[PDB]
Amino acid sequence: MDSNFLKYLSTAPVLFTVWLSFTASFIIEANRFFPDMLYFPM
Amino acid sequence: DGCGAYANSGSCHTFLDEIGDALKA
Amino acid sequence: LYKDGKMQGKGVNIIPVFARPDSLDGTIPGDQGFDPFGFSSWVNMKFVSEAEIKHGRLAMLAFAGIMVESIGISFPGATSILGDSKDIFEIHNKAVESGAMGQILLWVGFIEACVGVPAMNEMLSGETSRMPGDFGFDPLGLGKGDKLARKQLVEVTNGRLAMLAVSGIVHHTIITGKGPL
Amino acid sequence: DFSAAVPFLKRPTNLDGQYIGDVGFDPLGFSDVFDLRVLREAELKHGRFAMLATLGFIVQELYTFPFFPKMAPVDAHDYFVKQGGGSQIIFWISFVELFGVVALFETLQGKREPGDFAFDPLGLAKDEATLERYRLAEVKHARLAMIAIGGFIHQYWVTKQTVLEQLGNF
Amino acid sequence: DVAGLTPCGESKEFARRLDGSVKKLQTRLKKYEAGTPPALALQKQIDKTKNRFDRYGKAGLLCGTDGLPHLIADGRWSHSGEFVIPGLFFLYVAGWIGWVGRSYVLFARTADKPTEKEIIIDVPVALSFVSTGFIWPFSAFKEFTSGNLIVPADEITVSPR
Amino acid sequence: AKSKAVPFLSQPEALDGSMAGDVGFDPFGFSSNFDLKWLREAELKHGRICMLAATGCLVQEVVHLPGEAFSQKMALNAWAAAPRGGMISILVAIGLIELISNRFALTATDMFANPNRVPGDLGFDPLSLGGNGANRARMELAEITHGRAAMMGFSGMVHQMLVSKQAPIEQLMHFKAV
Ligand code: CLA
Ligand code: CLA
Ligand code: CLA
Ligand SMILES: CC1=C(C#C\C(C)=C/C=C/C(C)=C/C=C/C=C(C)/C=C/C=C(\C)C#CC2=C(C)C[C@@H](O)CC2(C)C)C(C)(C)C[C@H](O)C1
Ligand SMILES: CC1=C(C#C/C(C)=C/C=C/C(C)=C/C=C/C=C(C)/C=C/C=C(C)/C=C/C2=C(C)CCCC2(C)C)C(C)(C)C[C@H](O)C1
Ligand SMILES: CC1=C(C#C/C(C)=C/C=C/C(C)=C/C=C/C=C(C)/C=C/C=C(C)/C=C/C2=C(C)CCCC2(C)C)C(C)(C)C[C@H](O)C1
């Protein structure tokens, strides 16, 4: 892989978008498989 | 379960028996 | 005899449509210039030589056992539990269910794990200069100076012929339903 | 000067004959804009897929595994979509194609020939001249099978008959 | 129970909310044929509504006279899972984020061009840092006690008073 | 200059045959972006946990502790049926073992700060079975091969348990195709 393309991929907007999409996908899949978690079950 | 590796007739159907029945069909 | 350049060694090719590769050294017994797929260029020669010898000796014992059990010769009392038939496959399954082949598996595996694995490992690692198939077994004393070949070469050739014979006999028994002879 | 295959077309400047099977055939000028290493990797991958596909149409209709039902190969795609074998084949092809991505990156760095996967376990190419000869044979069979697989699939779509039955009558 | 509220599994208004939601989905279900994908989607929504109301009724949540669960956040252990334990989970994740960001800032200060490290992230080093954040309370406290977290007042710029 | 495991790829830098199990297999370039010491320590940890895990997934079916809570032949059922305070004790003890065995250097910035710290060398040799110099490289090769085989085996055993709802040995004895 070209080092310049990797350096572009390491820029703040690209990494910001990828990390926030990754985080959003975690929240979405957690709420898909474990919905309606108003509380911590104890 | 008191059966063998291959050629079992009863409630014992092993993976080798599954391979053999798959080949002989 | 060892017949280097007639039966073995460099320059011998029994199947000349596939030329003898440059990889074969000619030191190994049974070197008759047959490696069309060039396996000798990259495999370890001691390991595959010992594997050829082990497959061959197993097939020789297999041919002798298959023929003596398909003709009808049996040990005393051996017909009763193992069935009074002559079919080798049913003999295998009957002796498995009796437990005889479990005992054979246990002892052959014990021998193979206890000395076979260390012999192969020390031969490959270069700690004993042990030759392939050399388990130092000569109780009756038949090769001392004739060991170079006319013992080794005849062993490997009979091994290969037994391999082909046992394979043929098994698949013929499958297609025909009747044991050999 | 001019193309060796098409005598009235000029030779494409990037087709200098370094790649085996070059007859100077590129009238649309794909090699004038795109990297020829990528194009040759694509050509060989498409062709090898097509060669395996044509051999699969011949054997897979001559013989069928006992643990599978019998059907036509075009209907076998639709059947194995639902059965789950097609997902397995797609997954394993994708898994190999990840290292194909790595191999393509190695080709773009000039450290790998555009078709060389170093896969010759039977040692069939001994010396150089054999390797060029088998390269020309592989490229020709790749292009030929690329045409032939489309022939097989489209002719099955029109006649609803497999190749070997289509040979026997009309 | 607490603050005059009743448990949701015995509140009649909680049951009325559940019945109203199920009826509102069922009157939409009535206009579609059985086996159609809208019918299956609506029945799945009905199942999710029923499961959610059952789970909320069996969780010890308290419902007011409106009919909705009311959270207790005064520190009592019978309702620690409504605010306190989600709070601990947030505080762990947030301290992780703060610790790894501070560590990356202090690494970037050592680089040849720090601002380039700010706009173009050193991804392996940043991934090392985000791996380090699982033990952030002990690491941050040891950073504090060794004088490496707080800087003295004579080394910070301030405006004229 | 080409990788031995993958002959169509160039040899990865920082892989030079020094470590045990090094066959030049790193097509994705993990060792070109991350340090080999952390990767080897992680590989040994994943492999050792999987050695214990595969051995458990086979043994717990055959041998149980007494009691109803320990009577599940299938390991994914034994995860839930075992007493919860015991499994939380297991979690806490593993945490203490990870804390003390790495000598308070647990992270990607402070583990291997001591130059004497070797990847996967926690100092663990209770019976001193490593007292042999020429045995060492073969021992490390055997350990990493057992760990890699255990990773593949335990991964397969868990997901086949999910598919079949059967413990591994009795799945092999009572096999049902999908
Ligand atoms: C074709 C048969 C044959 C021949 C010529 C050899 C030759 C050799 N073997 Mg060998 N071997 C064989 C079969 C054979 N082996 C089989 C089948 C086994 C497995 C049990 C072994 C296991 C073995 C070991 C473990 C070792 C050797 C060794 C040796 C070497 C020295 C010993 C010697 O001269 O014995 C040759 C002497 C004979 C073969 C005596 C003749 C006995 C006859 C053939 C018995 C036949 C029984 C019966 C009639 C079979 C027919 C029945 C059937 C028709 C139903 C020599 C290269 C030693 C060595 O240094 O390796 C290099 C060694 O360590 N061999
Ligand atoms: C390295 C991350 C970092 C850290 C440790 C802090 C720490 C602090 N900030 Mg600050 N801040 C940051 C980033 C950070 N800030 C950024 C990026 C912004 C611009 C949006 C601000 C804007 C900001 C304001 C406006 C205020 C603070 C305040 C504070 C203080 C209280 C905590 C707080 O309110 O958090 C809340 C923080 C935010 C709402 C903004 C955070 C934005 C993201 C989520 C954090 C950055 C994460 C970063 C991308 C990680 C990359 C690491 C990776 C490369 C390895 C504390 C000193 C407050 C203060 O003075 O209290 C005394 C205050 O009023 N900060
Ligand atoms: C990855 C490891 C692992 C995990 C998470 C589990 C998890 C579990 N096992 Mg199990 N087990 C394992 C490996 C594992 N096993 C191995 C290797 C064996 C063979 C010795 C067993 C034999 C075993 C039996 C006989 C039984 C269980 C049972 C159970 C369950 C209850 C806990 C219990 O009583 O443990 C019991 C644990 C043991 C008897 C041995 C555990 C020893 C481990 C491997 C620790 C050794 C390494 C340690 C961390 C020291 C290294 C430190 C160093 C690196 C610094 C639980 C689901 C019970 C159950 O529910 O039945 C199905 C039960 O009856 N286990
Ligand atoms: C360090 C040393 C210590 C030591 C120690 C420890 C206790 C040493 C023990 C190491 C042990 C745990 C080795 C475990 C190996 C298991 C691996 C190889 C295999 C899984 C098999 C795979 C292939 C499979 C599976 C398959 C699956 C996929 C599909 C199924 O259908 C079939 C099947 C089940 C076959 C001690 C304490 C002695 C002290 C000493 O001073 C120092
Ligand atoms: C959608 C679908 C599927 C499908 C499908 C597929 C794979 C469909 C079709 C695929 C392909 C590849 C079609 C075309 C093949 C080749 C052609 C036309 C070559 C022409 C060559 C010529 C004219 C040569 C000319 C020439 C000559 C004479 C010589 C000189 C040079 C030149 C001028 C070039 C399934 C079954 C896989 C899955 C699913 O269930 C449904
Ligand atoms: C490299 C190496 C080694 C090695 C090694 C080994 C052992 C490596 C790898 C071995 C194997 C067997 C890998 C793959 C296993 C199977 C998979 C992923 C199946 C997935 C199936 C699925 C998702 C099915 C899904 C399904 C489908 C499609 C449809 C039906 C539903 C369902 C069943 C769910 C050593 C140890 C010798 C050491 C050496 O020094 C280095």
- Could you give the CA distance from residue D139 to residue D45 in angstroms, rounded to a whole number? 11
- Find out whether the beta carbon of E140 lies less than 6 Å from any atom of ligand 2: no
The H or E element spanning position F17 is none
- Could you give the CA distance from residue D5 to residue E10 in angstroms, rounded to a whole number? 88
Q: Locate tokens 């082990």: which residue?
A: C54
- Could you give the CA distance from residue D88 to residue D77 in angstroms, rounded to a whole number? 12
By the CB < 8 Å criterion, does E21 face chain F?
no
- Contact status, residue F176 vs residue F164, Cβ threshold 8 Å: yes
Q: Closest residue (by CA) to atom 7 of ligand 4?
A: F52
E strands, chain E, in order? 6-7, 62-63, 69-70
Nearest partner of E89 among A34, F89, A39, F98, judged by Cα: A39
Q: Closest residue (by CA) to atom 31 of ligand 3?
A: F82
Q: Which two tokens stand for residue E111?
A: 């680089």
Q: What is the CA radius of gyration of chain F?
A: 20
For residue D133, the SS3 value is helix
- Contact status, residue B8 vs residue B14, Cβ threshold 8 Å: yes
For residue C4, the SS3 value is strand
Q: What is the C-alpha end-to-end distance of chain D, expressed in Å?
A: 45
CA-to-CA separations, E37 to C91, C166, E29, E45, F17, in angstroms, rounded: 60, 63, 11, 12, 59
Amino acid at E28: R
Taking the CA of residue D27 and the nearest CA in chain F, the distance in Å comes to 32
Span from the CA of E102 to the centroid of ligand 2 (angstroms)? 9
Using a CB-CB cut-off of 8 Å, the residues of chain B touching C96 are: 4
Resolution in A: 2.1
Query: Solved by what technique?
Result: cryo-EM
- Contact status, residue C26 vs residue C10, Cβ threshold 8 Å: yes
The H or E element spanning position E119 is helix E114-119
Taking residue F166's Cβ as centre, other Cβ atoms within 10 Å add up to 18
Q: Which two tokens stand for residue D154?
A: 């489209």
Span from the CA of F56 to the centroid of ligand 3 (angstroms)? 6
Mutate to test the interface with B, among D64, D67, D68, D70 (most CBs of B within 10 A): D67
- Could you give the CA distance from residue F158 to residue F165 in angstroms, rounded to a whole number? 10
Q: Which residues contact D21 (CB under 8 A, 6 or more apart)?
A: D135, D136, D139, D140, D143
DSSP assignment letter at D12: P
By the CB < 8 Å criterion, does B15 face chain D?
no
- Could you give the CA distance from residue C162 to residue C64 in angstroms, rounded to a whole number? 9
Using a CB-CB cut-off of 8 Å, the residues of chain C touching B4 are: 96-97
Q: Which residues contact E57 (CB under 8 A, 6 or more apart)?
A: E8, E9, E14
Whether residues D116 and F6 touch (CB distance < 8 A) is answered with no
- Contact status, residue E85 vs residue A42, Cβ threshold 8 Å: yes
Strand partners, E70: E62
Q: Which two tokens stand for residue F96?
A: 């203490």
- Contact status, residue F14 vs residue F31, Cβ threshold 8 Å: yes
Ligand of minimum distance to the alpha carbon of F158: 4
What's the longest Cα–Cα distance across chain B?
A: 27
- Contact status, residue E38 vs residue A20, Cβ threshold 8 Å: no
Backbone angles phi, psi at F142, to 5 degrees: -65, -40
- Could you give the CA distance from residue E101 to residue C179 in angstroms, rounded to a whole number? 79
Q: Closest residue (by CA) to atom 61 of ligand 3?
A: F70
The alpha carbon torsion through D33, D34, D36, D41 (nearest 10 deg) reads -160
Strand partners, E69: E63
- Could you give the CA distance from residue E121 to residue E97 in angstroms, rounded to a whole number? 16
Q: Which two tokens stand for residue E93?
A: 């994740």
Q: Which two tokens stand for residue E24?
A: 């509102």
Amino acid at A8: Y
For chain E, helix (H) and strand (E) counts, in that order, are 6, 3
Nearest partner of D72 among D151, D170, D149, D156, judged by Cα: D156
- Find out whether the beta carbon of F163 lies less than 6 Å from any atom of ligand 6: yes
Nearest partner of D75 among D66, D67, D91, D64, judged by Cα: D64
Q: Locate tokens 């929240």: which residue?
A: A27
For residue E70, the SS3 value is strand
